[PDB]
Design a binder for this molecule. Structure first.
Ligand SMILES: Nc1ncnc2c1ncn2[C@@H]1O[C@H](COP(=O)(O)OP(=O)(O)O)[C@@H](O)[C@H]1O
Ligand code: VO4
Ligand SMILES: [Mg+2]
Lengths: 125, 817, 45
């Protein structure tokens, strides 16, 4: 019902139901909630990541009071970016997506703000 | 040891620039002012020394100064010399205190030589001279090239803290490729054995390293495995360099913003055709020939019938061994590299079957006979007949059809075809031109096989160019091979001088910044005496070849009278009829014009081309892929020199369209020894790479030349509210970005269409950009994953009713048991 | 090698970077008890 039952669901997806997820896919998994660690913290992580460690890491590092804090930047929050200019930042930086990019904007809806995106992503999760 | 003609050039290039102020306000010498001087017996008794550090004696002489030798230590004898031979020297300055040469107080010839002397010998080969970067050949691995260093320059924030290196350049080149989205190019410049090929590999290894491990390295695998094959097939041992590149390498690479090569295109040009057939003494043929006749397995030694390295006519039997090179261990690495290039064991076997065939055909001895009526008509030896028959079956060709085009003279006039017989010397040429074409087409077939797997579909958009050419090479005897190499070097220089000086001078002036002129020496005259169409050494060669009644001797005469003036062309003092000199950027180089027309013409006949195209083997057919079968007189587009210049010309414009980066490699000695400084050889290279000339570019002040648009793409994240602000104009946008980030009125400057900024405040904006980049690198990565998450979720949601049947049937099964 | 030439950047702990012999170019901090005064303008010859 809570986050505990939702975290387990998210592991079986990124691991593709694997017991031991690959380091790179584990980072996709943490980010999907609103978890980003410091350069040092990201080295403190174990060699082989498993479900048991993932769920401990989930409790500690996930934001509960405001699930997506990392999206808020208040110079970037209040400001309105056009749909085309927003995709410009996205297409150059992108490390994941291909055509699921059009589907992210649909999850939000011309001029958008970060507090709108975070609010909609809180309902997505 | 350095030759007198090298000394000749080295002596002439020195010149007195700035007057010596080694005198106190009253009228007596200071507390021992030290000055560099060319006068001392230590300089006379040794070539490697051109200048000694001398201290002015506490005595006097203001008109004809008194000195004593300090570095190197001398007799301590006070000798007097003229002030025209006195150059200002920095004493308090430490050579390892700073990276940029332009930071010295006195930038005279010896002061720069010493600053580089103390950097090389303390094992700090890389020294900047922005935009240029000087890399002196250490001849020993300093470990500064290893993965640890790659990762440093990669993940280190401040560029200011990092010391000069090939990676400083590799990162700043990739910083603009993604920063502004402009294609960039890296250019390794320098003479034969300066370190071009090795530096290319280091910068390639840098781009190979990725921050995030989530990339398809399958393409990046073939890209890196190609290089030790390209050096086995294209590089050979010379007296100048033991890993001398006899081919010109050019790459185009799409690299990720974190690291790693997505796609590439290795385009190799001009392979030294003569190196396959004949090699000079102490000089060796292509590494792969020796590697295959040493490291081949017992199965290939019997199937191909391989003999010893000495037993081949196309291989110098005395030069067979190279110091510090194990052709067996290299071969092991070469075979695995071929596998990594997606070549099957069948494809690799055929590659070496052709090589075995080439080697075997060379050993076959053609002899004179009283045939055709005109006599001397060639014939394949009775004992060497089986040798020839085995070779043709090794290259997968008809042994009777290859024999016919080499022994029978086929000449067609108008309509009526005429049959004859080729002479002894003529058939030896046909045998040689066949081996040359088989090797060159095979070498280029591997390039095509590589490009077939590594090339991006829909070409390149924003790629990274890299140019590894054959550096200036001078031997006792220089020919057309040496002529084409030195032309490449002069060409790379003309475009360097243009971009770095001529264009920058006009840019600052047109923008309304600096009206001041840039002083530099260009090769404009010497490049025209070789490459200007109609009036050049290359154009007169083509005219002699296309002309039926034209000789090698007639060519020299054709140049000597036409290219008489401008000085750059000087015909030889000894045997002027067959020899000539060119006043290169590295000094005078004499070429023996013997076989110049024959070498320029050497490109396999259409008669033998059809035999290799009709082959029952697929690889042997694919060598002459879409090749124009030509018969009769050689066309202007078929001539090697003409085909070379046009290939070079096209390549240069491709580089002119991008944003180049220059690496200037220096070969410190000919003896090939580490921590050995030879002032003459280095000084010539300080001129030929325009290192001393690159100092004038300090006058510009500003180290950022980009349009309002280019500034707004790379920098907008500082404040997106005033950057996206449609109402305010772009000229006013760029200035407001610098207002929020905070800048003094001295760091920035308006500009007509460009935005000029000194390096002084450049990193201050770049770090302020990074403070807003990191908070958005994660912000991008969180939203990007939150959707990537729901992609799997929505795809699973549609499969839920199908799973509800698996589980209901499982519950059913649990009831039965 | 027993001693390396370093340089203070920008205190009870010095922001030193190894210069002679050339190093990683990493600014590290060390105790002043291991800091000896060096002559720079002085020529050994
Ligand atoms: N960065 C380097 N570190 C150490 N040795 C080097 C370096 N660059 C070149 N060398 C030396 O120089 C030799 C020739 O280098 P190379 O790049 O192949 O020259 P070229 O430009 O003539 O092709 C190598 O065999 C090696 O000993
Ligand atoms: O030896 V070179 O590769 O510079 O021709
Ligand atoms: Mg080179």
């Amino acid at each position: 019902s809570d986050m505990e039952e939702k975290f387990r669901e998210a592991f079986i997806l990124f691991s593709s139901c694997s017991d031991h997820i690959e380091m790179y896919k584990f980072f996709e998994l943490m980010n999907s909630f609103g978890i980003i660690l410091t350069n040092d913290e990201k080295a403190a992580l174990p060699n082989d990541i498993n479900m048991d460690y993932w769920l401990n890491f989930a409790k500690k590092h996930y934001n509960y009071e405001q699930p997506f804090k990392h999206i808020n930047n208040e110079q970037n929050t209040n400001v309105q970016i056009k749909i085309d200019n927003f995709l410009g930042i996205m297409k150059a930086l992108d490390t994941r997506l291909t055509e699921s990019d059009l589907n992210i904007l649909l999850q939000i809806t011309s001029t958008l703000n970060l507090k709108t995106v975070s609010q909609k992503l809180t309902e997505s999760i | 040891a350095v030759t007198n003609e090298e000394i000749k050039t080295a002596s002439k290039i020195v010149r007195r620039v700035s007057n010596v102020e080694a005198f106190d306000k009253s009228g007596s010498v200071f507390k021992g002012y030290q000055i560099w001087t060319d006068i001392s017996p230590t300089i006379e008794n040794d070539p490697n020394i051109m200048f000694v550090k001398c201290v002015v004696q506490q005595g006097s002489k203001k008109e004809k100064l008194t000195v004593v030798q300090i570095d190197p230590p001398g007799t301590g004898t006070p000798y007097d010399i003229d002030p025209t031979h006195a150059w200002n020297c920095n004493s308090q300055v430490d050579p390892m205190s700073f990276g940029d040469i332009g930071l010295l107080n006195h930038t005279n010839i010896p002061c720069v030589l010493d600053f580089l002397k103390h950097r090389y010998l303390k094992n700090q080969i890389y020294t900047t001279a922005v935009p240029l970067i000087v890399a002196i050949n250490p001849y020993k691995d300093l470990g500064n090239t290893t993965n640890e260093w790659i990762r440093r320059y990669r993940d280190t924030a401040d560029h200011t803290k990092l010391p000069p290196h090939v990676f400083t350049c590799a990162r700043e080149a990739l910083s603009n490729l993604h920063g502004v989205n402009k294609s960039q190019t890296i250019i390794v410049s320098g003479e034969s054995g300066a370190g071009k090929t090795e530096a290319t590999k280091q910068i390639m290894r840098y781009f190979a390293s990725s921050k995030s491990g989530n990339m398809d390295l399958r393409i990046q695998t073939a890209i890196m495995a190609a290089n030790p094959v390209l050096e086995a097939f294209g590089n050979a041992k010379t007296i100048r360099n033991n890993n001398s590149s006899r081919f010109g390498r050019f790459m185009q690479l799409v690299i990720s913003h974190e690291g790693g090569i997505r796609y590439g295109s290795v385009v190799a040009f001009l392979l030294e055709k003569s190196r396959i057939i004949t090699q000079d003494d102490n000089e060796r043929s292509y590494h792969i020939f020796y590697q295959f006749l040493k490291g081949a397995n017992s199965t290939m030694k019997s199937k191909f019938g391989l003999k010893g390295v000495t037993e081949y006519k196309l291989l110098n039997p005395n030069s067979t061994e190279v110091s510090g090179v194990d052709d067996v261990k290299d071969f092991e690495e070469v075979i695995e590299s071929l596998k990594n290039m997606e070549l099957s064991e069948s494809d690799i076997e055929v590659i070496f079957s052709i090589v075995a065939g080439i080697l075997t055909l060379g050993n076959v001895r053609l002899i004179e006979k009283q045939e055709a009526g005109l006599s001397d008509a060639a014939a394949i030896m009775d004992e060497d007949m089986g040798v020839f028959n085995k070779a043709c079956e090794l290259m997968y060709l008809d042994p009777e059809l290859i024999k016919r085009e080499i022994l029978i003279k086929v000449t067609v006039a108008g309509g009526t075809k005429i049959e004859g017989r080729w002479n002894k010397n003529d058939a030896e040429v046909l045998k040689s031109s066949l081996c040359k074409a088989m090797y060159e087409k095979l070498f280029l077939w591997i390039i095509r096989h590589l490009n077939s797997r590594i090339e991006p579909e829909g070409g390149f958009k924003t790629f990274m160019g890299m140019l590894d050419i054959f550096g200036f090479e001078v031997f006792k005897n220089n020919s057309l091979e040496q002529l084409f190499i030195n032309i490449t070097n002069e060409m790379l220089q003309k475009n360097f001088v243009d971009i770095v000086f001529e264009r920058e001078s006009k840019l600052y002036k047109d923008e309304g910044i600096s009206t001041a002129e840039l002083k530099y020496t260009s090769n404009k005259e010497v490049i025209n005496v070789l490459c200007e169409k109609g009036k050049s050494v290359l154009s007169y060669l083509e005219d002699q070849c296309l002309a039926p009644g034209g000789t090698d001797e007639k060519f020299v005469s054709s140049c000597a009278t036409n290219l008489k003036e401008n000085n750059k062309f000087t015909p030889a003092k000894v045997a002027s009829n067959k020899n000539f000199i060119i006043q290169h950027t590295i000094g005078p180089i004499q070429y023996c014009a013997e076989s110049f027309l024959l070498k320029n013409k050497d490109v396999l006949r259409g008669d033998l081309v059809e035999v290799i195209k009709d082959s029952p083997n697929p690889i042997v057919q694919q060598l002459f892929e879409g090749q124009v079968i030509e018969k009769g007189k050689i066309a202007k587009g078929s001539l090697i020199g003409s085909q070379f210049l046009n290939q070079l010309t096209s390549l240069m414009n491709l580089i002119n369209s991008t944003e180049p980066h220059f690496i200037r490699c220096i070969k410190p000695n000919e003896n090939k020894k580490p921590l050995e400084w030879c002032e003459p050889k280095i000084l010539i290279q300080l001129h030929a790479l325009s290192i001393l000339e690159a100092l004038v570019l300090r006058q510009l002040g500003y180290s950022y030349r980009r349009t309002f648009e280019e500034f707004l793409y790379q920098y907008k994240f500082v404040d997106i509210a005033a950057a996206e602000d449609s109402s305010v104009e772009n000229q006013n946008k760029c200035v407001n970005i610098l207002k929020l980030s905070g800048l003094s009125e001295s760091m920035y400057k308006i500009g007509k269409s460009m935005v000029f900024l000194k390096q002084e405040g450049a990193k201050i904006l770049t770090k302020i950009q990074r403070e807003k980049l990191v908070e958005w690198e994660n912000c991008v990565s969180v939203i990007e994953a939150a959707i990537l998450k729901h992609k799997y979720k929505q795809k699973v949601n549609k499969n839920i009713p199908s799973l509800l049947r698996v589980q209901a049937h499982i519950r059913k099964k649990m009831v039965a048991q």
